[PDB]
Symmetry: C3
């Protein structure tokens, strides 16, 4: 259970970073 | 508290999926 | 470890509010 919760948080952290990257590209590119 | 944390992570998941789909729309005009 | 997860979760909540707002702006030019 603990490992699943860490994995999910880690995955969410990567998804925000991907989304901010893409937003910046759309705004400025 | 564990259960509150899991709900919060599920909320966050629902919100980044929504935002991903929004960004996609923006990418296509 | 638990405390750290909670702080990371709060951080992420702030980040997705920020990105939600930014995306609302970009949607409207
Ligand atoms: Cl566990
Ligand atoms: Cl595309
Ligand atoms: Cl702890
Ligand atoms: Zn596509
Ligand atoms: Zn496409
Ligand atoms: Zn709106
Ligand atoms: Zn509008």
């Amino acid at each position: 259970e603990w490992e699943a919760l860490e994995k999910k948080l880690a995955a969410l952290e990567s998804k925000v970073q991907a989304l901010e990257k893409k937003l910046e590209a759309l705004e400025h590119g």
